Amino acid sequence: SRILLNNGAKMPILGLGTWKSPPGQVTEAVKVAIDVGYRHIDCAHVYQNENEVGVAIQEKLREQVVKREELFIVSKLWCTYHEKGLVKGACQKTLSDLKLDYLDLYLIHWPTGFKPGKEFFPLDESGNVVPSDTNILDTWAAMEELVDEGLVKAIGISNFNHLQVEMILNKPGLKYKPAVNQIECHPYLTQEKLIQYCQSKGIVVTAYSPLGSPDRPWAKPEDPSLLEDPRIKAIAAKHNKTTAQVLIRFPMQRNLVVIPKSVTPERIAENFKVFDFELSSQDMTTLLSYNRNWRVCALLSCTSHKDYPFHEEF
């Protein structure tokens, strides 16, 4: 149920996602998740609900439902805080909101730094994101400091392509390797090349949007739908599982971590019931065959940033 990271710690391979969980619903979602066995929560400042996630964490700690050491809480540095002098404050605000004195894992949320200010996505008058002149290597050094200051136990990256991972791995004076790369991954974006690369370097990969993010705000009715794909339903039916359970078990059998989001108590519980069956090797290859290079998370306004990650092949 956990995977060993290159910092010596173990990470639960199933966690609860929180992007889009409404603030009025996410405290109960996180309390139910811990009650039915989740021990990893995926968070981010940019999701604007860390305070409410933190109320749930703190109540289950206070209630002695779980000990802090059994939890694995992940958050992410937003793009407007890549400047060396802003990274510690950004981490401390997340810590204060989550009511924690450390994070188990803190990620660079995207490789692109944006102009600092109140706006999460500062745009110029024609809608392009306004970059900052920070680069990923100085940001990485700032993340290493957080480990040395006790604020985080592990650091990692997210939405880094393989040349950007390689840039971190080849950073002069590198002190801590990234422990995780968290990337979009599901049967329509299988990521074989980038996962192989990261795993060969001992970097654990976390699969986000494993259900295809049906609640993403830019969904169009005509878009492909994993949960409604009859081929995936058929695999589910064969194992007497739901389609969501097959989509969650798939990355687990590729030695990935996976973080499905829900605020629906019944689905939170359903989504956790994925440790009592196995997809066959044939099932796994068939699921991989549905790759279409279809990406849910790739915002147009960011495509001209120098560090935009999805022009590269992987």
Ligand X SMILES: O=C(O)Cn1ccc(=O)n(Cc2nc3cc(Cl)ccc3s2)c1=O
Q: Give the footprint of ligand X on this chain (CB under 6 A).
A: 19, 44, 46, 79, 110, 112, 297-299, 302, 305, 308
What is the contact mask toward ligand NAP in residues 64 to 103, using x (rule: CB under 6 A)?
----------------------------------------
Q: Is the dihedral of CA 283, 271, 243, 159 positive or negative?
A: negative
153 or 305: whose CB is closer to ligand X? 305
Distance CA 153, CA 103 (A): 6
192 or 215: whose CB is closer to ligand NAP? 215
Q: Which does 298 bind (CB under 5 to 8 A by kind): ligand X, ligand NAP, none?
A: ligand X
- How many CB atoms are closer than 10 A to CB 20? 14
DSSP letter for each residue of 105-133: EEEES-S--B--SS-SS-B-TTS-B-B-S
Question: Residue 164 interacts with ligand NAP (CB under 6 A)?
Answer: no
- In the region spanning residues 107 to 126, those forming contacts with ligand NAP, defined by CB under 6 A, are 109
Is 245 annotated to bind ligand?
Answer: yes
Distance CA 294, CA 100 (A): 36
Question: Residue 14 interacts with ligand NAP (CB under 6 A)?
Answer: no
The answer to whether residues 226 and 211 touch, using CB atoms and an 8 Å cutoff, is yes
Output the CA–CA distances (angstroms, integers) from residue 10 to 71, 144, 179, 313, in the order listed. Answer: 10, 19, 11, 31
47 is catalytic: yes
Helix (H) or strand (E) holding 232: helix 230-239
Question: Residue 39 interacts with ligand NAP (CB under 6 A)?
Answer: no
Burial of 261 (0-12, 13-18, 19+ CB in 10 A): buried
85 or 216: whose CB is closer to ligand NAP? 216
Question: Residue 134 interacts with ligand NAP (CB under 6 A)?
Answer: no
186 or 305: whose CB is closer to ligand X? 305
Name the amino acid, one letter, at 192.
E
The SS3 of residue 248 is helix
Give the residue ranges of the annotated binding site for NADP(+).
8-17, 209-271
- Known binding-site residues for substrate equal 109
- The residues of the shown chain that bind ligand NAP, judged by CB under 6 A, are 17-20, 42, 109, 158-159, 182, 208-216, 227, 242, 244, 259-264, 267, 270-271, 297
Active site residues: 47
